[PDB]
Every structure is written in structure tokens, then in C-alpha cells.
Amino acid sequence: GSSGSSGSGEKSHTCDECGKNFCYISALRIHQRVHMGEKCSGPSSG
Ligand SMILES: [Zn+2]
């Protein structure tokens, strides 16, 4: 019974969709638009 949630990445927001990098999260969101496709009724936010 011990918590083992380690987090190792980068100080910069990385797109889990492709693996890009964006200093400002705001930018990432704008880029994510390129991934938007598998949605017809916007089930989840993003
Ligand atoms: Zn991406």
C-alpha cells in the first residue's frame, strides 16, 4: 500500500496526440485542432 505516481516529462506542454511541444499551453490547444476528427457530438472537452 504505497503511492507510486511518478511524473517525468518537461516544463513545456507536449501534445500527447502527436508529441509536439508548445511553450504556452494556449498554443497546444490551437494545434490540437489538427487532431480533432474522431468527434461528431463533442463527447468530451478539448
Ligand atoms: Zn498534436
Structural contact between residues 10 and 21, judged by C-beta atoms closer than 8 angstroms = yes
Hey, what domains does the chain have and what are their CATH numbers?
11-46 (3.30.160.60)
- CA-wise closest residue to 35 among 19, 13, 23: 19
**Cα of 12 from ligand 1 centre, angstroms:** 14
**Cα of 45 from ligand 1 centre, angstroms:** 16
Contacts with 46 (C-beta within 8 Å, 6 or more apart), sequence order:
32, 36
Please name the method used to determine this structure.
NMR
**Cα of 13 from ligand 1 centre, angstroms:** 11
Distance CA 11, CA 33 (A): 22
**Cα of 5 from ligand 1 centre, angstroms:** 25
